[PDB]
């Protein structure tokens, strides 16, 4: 069956960058978009964007256009989310999903230190 | 962007009763005869779990106690009957127009 295994939780410093991963097994990632979502307890769930691993195509929500960079590697069946110039509002749980949006990873917690 | 508003924000229900959660979109989520509204269930510390896709389709592995209805801007999730394990937060999500957007969630508790 399909599993999305996300990378470990990260404590990140303001102004720094962090790159999260989503390693897919039991599914060829060339076969579908991978989607990234952000969740905060107050502001709720937000869709960051989708990447097509077969051609590198990306579509972002405008609020994430200068914050997030999605990449993928079919050679490793892995999708990445790079977050840049981190600030407090970037602290969140980040999810990847595929198979339309039916199958989700377990989430990666990003915390931002003071 | 399409804004999704859920009603109620929180719901306490008796075991064995029916419950309905409403999701209203600020613009249509319809295209070409289909309605691109999904419903998710989430329990604390877990990822959202897809229950219903395209308004009325039950996701594989999800009990038939859950069903979805609606089109255009107005959608509902029905739980029949409510069981103890249903305590969770429920979210609607539209995937008709970019950016995809989510409702604010409805927290269901058992009385």
């Amino acid at each position: 069956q399909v599993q999305l295994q996300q990378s470990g939780d990260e404590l990140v410093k303001p102004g720094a960058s962090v790159k999260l991963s989503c390693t897919v097994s039991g599914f060829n990632i060339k076969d579908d978009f991978i989607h990234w979502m952000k969740q905060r307890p107050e502001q709720g769930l937000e869709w960051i964007g989708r990447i097509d691993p077969a051609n590198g195509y990306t579509k972002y929500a405008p609020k994430f256009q200068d914050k997030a960079t999605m990449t993928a590697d079919t050679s490793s069946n892995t999708a990445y989310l790079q977050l840049s110039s981190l600030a407090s509002e970037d602290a969140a749980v980040y999810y990847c999903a595929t198979y339309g949006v039916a199958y989700w990873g377990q989430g990666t917690l990003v915390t931002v230190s003071a | 962007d399409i804004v999704l508003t859920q009603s109620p924000a929180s719901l306490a229900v008796s075991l064995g009763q029916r419950a309905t959660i409403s999701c209203k979109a600020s613009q249509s989520v319809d295209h070409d005869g289909d309605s691109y509204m999904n419903w998710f269930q989430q329990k604390p510390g877990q990822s959202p779990k897809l229950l219903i896709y395209a308004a009325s389709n039950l996701e594989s592995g999800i009990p038939a106690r859950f069903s979805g209805s609606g089109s255009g801007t107005d959608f509902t999730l029905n739980i029949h009957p409510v069981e103890e394990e249903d305590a969770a937060t429920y979210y609607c999500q539209q995937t008709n127009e970019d950016p995809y957007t989510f409702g604010g969630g409805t927290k269901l508790e058992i009385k």
């Binding site: 195509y57 198979y99 339309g100 039916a102 | 996701e59 995937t95 995809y100």
Partner: peptide, 14 residues
């Protein structure tokens, strides 16, 4: 099967 319709695919790379 949620692959086809849990997102709109009519023009998902336009």
């Amino acid at each position: 099967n949620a692959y086809n319709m849990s997102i709109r695919r009519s023009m998902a790379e336009s």
